[PDB]
Amino acid sequence: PLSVFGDRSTGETIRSQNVMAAASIANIVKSSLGPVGLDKMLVDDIGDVTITNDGATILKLLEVEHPAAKVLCEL
Amino acid sequence: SSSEDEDAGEGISVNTGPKGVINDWRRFKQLET
């Protein structure tokens, strides 16, 4: 009926999807909080290695596709 | 002896069907492009 060339998610489905994306972004860096947190070591596709504990650096180096996850990274 | 050789209406001008099927048409067209 709409005839829109795309996908549509409405209501509880999209709300749960956004919450899942935000929770995944949080859980990525939750292990690097506080004096007993531990660093993460990121490897690029060209073999470059970055070892960091900063949340901003981790979220900037990560390649993210979900819009809510992008919102959290920009936050 | 035994011893021997043996031994009409061509003009259609389809009206709305293309509108209905444009979804699948573009679905294939993106991959084809």
PDB file of N, CA and C in Angstrom, chain B residues 4-21:
ATOM      1  N   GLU B   4      33.453 -77.128 -48.778  1.00  0.00           N
ATOM      2  CA  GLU B   4      33.005 -76.092 -49.699  1.00  0.00           C
ATOM      3  C   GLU B   4      33.466 -74.749 -49.138  1.00  0.00           C
ATOM      4  N   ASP B   5      32.872 -73.658 -49.630  1.00  0.00           N
ATOM      5  CA  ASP B   5      33.217 -72.333 -49.125  1.00  0.00           C
ATOM      6  C   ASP B   5      32.994 -72.224 -47.621  1.00  0.00           C
ATOM      7  N   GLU B   6      32.090 -73.036 -47.068  1.00  0.00           N
ATOM      8  CA  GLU B   6      31.909 -73.062 -45.619  1.00  0.00           C
ATOM      9  C   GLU B   6      33.170 -73.550 -44.917  1.00  0.00           C
ATOM     10  N   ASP B   7      33.812 -74.579 -45.461  1.00  0.00           N
ATOM     11  CA  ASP B   7      35.021 -75.134 -44.862  1.00  0.00           C
ATOM     12  C   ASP B   7      35.915 -75.780 -45.914  1.00  0.00           C
ATOM     13  N   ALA B   8      -4.371  -9.530 -32.673  1.00  0.00           N
ATOM     14  CA  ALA B   8      -4.904  -8.175 -32.643  1.00  0.00           C
ATOM     15  C   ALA B   8      -4.615  -7.505 -31.302  1.00  0.00           C
ATOM     16  N   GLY B   9      -4.927  -6.216 -31.213  1.00  0.00           N
ATOM     17  CA  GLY B   9      -4.675  -5.470 -29.990  1.00  0.00           C
ATOM     18  C   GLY B   9      -3.212  -5.396 -29.615  1.00  0.00           C
ATOM     19  N   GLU B  10      -2.330  -5.257 -30.609  1.00  0.00           N
ATOM     20  CA  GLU B  10      -0.899  -5.194 -30.327  1.00  0.00           C
ATOM     21  C   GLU B  10      -0.555  -3.970 -29.487  1.00  0.00           C
ATOM     22  N   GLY B  11      -1.140  -2.821 -29.813  1.00  0.00           N
ATOM     23  CA  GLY B  11      -0.941  -1.633 -29.006  1.00  0.00           C
ATOM     24  C   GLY B  11      -1.617  -1.765 -27.658  1.00  0.00           C
ATOM     25  N   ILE B  12      -0.827  -1.928 -26.603  1.00  0.00           N
ATOM     26  CA  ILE B  12      -1.353  -2.172 -25.266  1.00  0.00           C
ATOM     27  C   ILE B  12      -1.312  -0.916 -24.404  1.00  0.00           C
ATOM     28  N   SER B  13      -0.186  -0.201 -24.404  1.00  0.00           N
ATOM     29  CA  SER B  13       0.017   0.973 -23.557  1.00  0.00           C
ATOM     30  C   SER B  13      -0.381   0.667 -22.113  1.00  0.00           C
ATOM     31  N   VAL B  14       0.363  -0.263 -21.505  1.00  0.00           N
ATOM     32  CA  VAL B  14       0.017  -0.742 -20.172  1.00  0.00           C
ATOM     33  C   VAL B  14       0.016   0.427 -19.197  1.00  0.00           C
ATOM     34  N   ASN B  15      -1.031   0.500 -18.376  1.00  0.00           N
ATOM     35  CA  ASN B  15      -1.355   1.715 -17.637  1.00  0.00           C
ATOM     36  C   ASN B  15      -0.797   1.727 -16.218  1.00  0.00           C
ATOM     37  N   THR B  16      -1.234   0.791 -15.375  1.00  0.00           N
ATOM     38  CA  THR B  16      -0.919   0.834 -13.955  1.00  0.00           C
ATOM     39  C   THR B  16      -0.032  -0.316 -13.500  1.00  0.00           C
ATOM     40  N   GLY B  17      -0.016  -1.425 -14.233  1.00  0.00           N
ATOM     41  CA  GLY B  17       0.811  -2.562 -13.906  1.00  0.00           C
ATOM     42  C   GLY B  17       2.267  -2.226 -13.640  1.00  0.00           C
ATOM     43  N   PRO B  18       2.880  -1.383 -14.484  1.00  0.00           N
ATOM     44  CA  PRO B  18       4.243  -0.927 -14.168  1.00  0.00           C
ATOM     45  C   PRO B  18       4.347  -0.238 -12.822  1.00  0.00           C
ATOM     46  N   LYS B  19       3.344   0.551 -12.440  1.00  0.00           N
ATOM     47  CA  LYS B  19       3.365   1.161 -11.115  1.00  0.00           C
ATOM     48  C   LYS B  19       3.313   0.097 -10.025  1.00  0.00           C
ATOM     49  N   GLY B  20       2.471  -0.920 -10.202  1.00  0.00           N
ATOM     50  CA  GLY B  20       2.388  -1.982  -9.214  1.00  0.00           C
ATOM     51  C   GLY B  20       3.656  -2.803  -9.097  1.00  0.00           C
ATOM     52  N   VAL B  21       4.374  -2.992 -10.208  1.00  0.00           N
ATOM     53  CA  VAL B  21       5.535  -3.874 -10.236  1.00  0.00           C
ATOM     54  C   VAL B  21       6.854  -3.109 -10.161  1.00  0.00           C
TER      55      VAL B  21
END
